[PDB]
Amino acid sequence: AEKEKNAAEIRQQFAMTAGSPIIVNDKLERYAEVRTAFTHPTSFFKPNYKGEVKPWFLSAYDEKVRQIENGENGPKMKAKNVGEARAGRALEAAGWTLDINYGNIYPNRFFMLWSGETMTNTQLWAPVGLDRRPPDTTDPVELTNYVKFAARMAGADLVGVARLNRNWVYSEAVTIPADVPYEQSLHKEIEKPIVFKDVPLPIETDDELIIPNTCENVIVAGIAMNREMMQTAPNSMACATTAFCYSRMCMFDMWLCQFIRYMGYYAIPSCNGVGQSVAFAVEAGLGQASRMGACITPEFGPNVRLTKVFTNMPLVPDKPIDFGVTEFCETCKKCARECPSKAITEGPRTFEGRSIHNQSGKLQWQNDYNKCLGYWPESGGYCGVCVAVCPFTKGNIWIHDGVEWLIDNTRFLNITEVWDGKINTYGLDADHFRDTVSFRKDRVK
């Protein structure tokens, strides 16, 4: 008979021995965040459909407007009517409500405060003194169970812990000066170094963002996106599940940082800022790196967003996982073949970046992320075709052969219906939600 799926068993079966799985060489340096395609001057500008050169997201706005006027849900993709086209973009735009300027990357600004002191919640609770009382628990085992339980309350579908590898922390962040109001933010962005110093608490000076040398650990969360909506990539409903998950990330960071602070430790939120989420997720055992470049998880494949929190709270690091992704990506190449911009390489992994947007010195598939971003104004969205076509995104991949779990190799061989179809709270799917049930034994060993 069919053995019922057991996600905890799967992770136990594929657990590796301790050690960062990412292979590096001597040319590895920390990466300046301004080099990402979203921010770098070589890639930031893209033409719109009239040939006007603009910040990429403004060119994409132009395409969204054109699609709604023409009753389309995506490039060359007719909607049922203009109202359906309108509804998809209204859902997408609303999803971003709790996210600043597409990713919350400015450290210690807006929602990403590095101290809780000025928050309305901290002020309301100040008489209890939870953020000023020394920790009552220093045992990493108990702290790991407490913080992972809190992480699930805070909206994580996956959570893992790693020691902080500074190689993945940006050498300089993109931010804004502290006196700049929101309406000027996009015009006043600056770079600011992230440094590690012997100080008691995270602190920002005029010159530096300072992380304490005591900042030992990173907690990584996976925030699951909706399968049906992502499968509409590159059209608007894939944009909407992306957007809503960014606001879920923001809530997660603030909730968890406050819990950690109220336990007597400090906590640094980040969302898409501070450092490279995929590398942290791999080191924390959420999944493995992939050809497309994302972290592929056993539960969701790559169809999951990542955020992370940095802390001095003593914790037990999780073990990395190896469930064969590297070997499958070596022969699969579906994302590379379906990529509308040919951004994803079909070749082997190397240590040599394809362009300024890649960090050299770590073994990975090297993709051209300027080509990727170029498709976003063209399509009026955030694409996601690679996530959508990846076999690991299917809910169907795990089988048990009577002895152990394995991947089913057979897997690698419209929007109106989405609006009219299955949905549940936060876009989670009750057919798979048991996969993320958690007891103490899977939170800490």
DSSP code for 15? B
Q: How many residues bind ligand SF4 (CB under 6 A)?
A: 24
Instruction: Provide the token pair at 207.
Output: 């010159």
**Does 199 help bind its own copies (rule: CB under 8 A)?**
no
Q: Which partner from the list ligand SF4, its own copies, ligand ZTN, none does 386 bind, CB cut-off 5 to 8 Å by kind?
A: ligand SF4
Q: Which partner from the list ligand ZTN, its own copies, ligand SF4, none does 91 bind, CB cut-off 5 to 8 Å by kind?
A: its own copies
Q: Pick between residue 38 and residue 398 the one whose CB is nearest to ligand ZTN.
A: 38
The residue written with tokens 């609770």 in the block is: 125
Phi/psi of residue 400, nearest 5 degrees: -115, 130
Q: Pick between residue 102 and residue 351 the one whose CB is nearest to ligand ZTN.
A: 102
The answer to whether 16 and 321 are in contact (CB under 8 A) is: yes
Instruction: Provide the token pair at 56.
Output: 């990429």
**Does 293 help bind ligand ZTN (rule: CB under 6 A)?**
no
**Does 272 help bind ligand ZTN (rule: CB under 6 A)?**
yes
Q: Measuring CA to CA, how many Å separate 160 from each of 144, 145, 442?
A: 9, 11, 11
Q: Which residues, listed in sequence order, are joined to residue 193 by a DSSP beta bridge? A: 172
Q: Pick between residue 40 and residue 291 the one whose CB is nearest to ligand SF4.
A: 291
Residue 412 DSSP SS3: helix
Instruction: Provide the token pair at 135.
Output: 């920790």
Q: Which partner from the list ligand SF4, ligand ZTN, its own copies, none does 344 bind, CB cut-off 5 to 8 Å by kind?
A: ligand SF4
Question: Which range binds its own copies by CB under 8 A, 123-131, 273-281, 291-299, 369-377?
Answer: 123-131
Exposure class string for 69-85: b at 16+ Cβ within 10 A, else e: eeebbbbebebeeeebb
Q: How many residues bind its own copies (CB under 8 A)?
A: 88
Q: Pick between residue 127 and residue 200 the one whose CB is nearest to ligand ZTN.
A: 127
Of 34, 87, 176, 281, the one binding its own copies by CB under 8 A: 87
Q: Which partner from the list its own copies, ligand SF4, ligand ZTN, none does 124 bind, CB cut-off 5 to 8 Å by kind?
A: its own copies
**Does 178 help bind its own copies (rule: CB under 8 A)?**
no
Question: Residue 218 half-sphere exposure, CB side, CA atoms within 13 Å?
Answer: 30
Instruction: Provide the token pair at 304.
Output: 């999951």
What is the rounded CA–CA span in Å between residue 427 and residue 423? 6
Each residue 395-434 as x (binds its own copies by CB under 8 A) or -, in order, gives: ------------------------xxxxxxxxxx-xx-xx
Q: Pick between residue 169 and residue 390 the one whose CB is nearest to ligand SF4.
A: 390
Instruction: Provide the token pair at 36.
Output: 């990402």
**Does 276 help bind ligand ZTN (rule: CB under 6 A)?**
no
Q: Report in angstroms how near the CB of residue 92 gets to its own copies at its nearest.
A: 9
Residues 379-398 that bind ligand SF4 (CB under 6 A): 383-386, 389-392
Is there a cis peptide before residue 234, judged by omega within 30 degrees of 0?
yes
Instruction: Provide the token pair at 45.
Output: 């500008």
- Scanning 18-129, the segments in alpha helix (DSSP H) are 41-44, 56-69, 82-95, 120-125
**Does 115 help bind its own copies (rule: CB under 8 A)?**
no
Residues 368-407 that bind ligand ZTN (CB under 6 A): 382
Q: Which partner from the list its own copies, ligand ZTN, ligand SF4, none does 328 bind, CB cut-off 5 to 8 Å by kind?
A: ligand SF4
CA dihedral 44, 49, 50, 56 (to 10 degrees): -10
State CA 74 to chain mean position distance. 24
Q: Which residues bind ligand SF4 (CB under 6 A)?
A: 290-292, 328-329, 332-335, 339-341, 343-344, 372, 375, 383-386, 389-392
Q: Which residues bind ligand ZTN (CB under 6 A)?
A: 38, 57, 102-103, 242, 272, 382
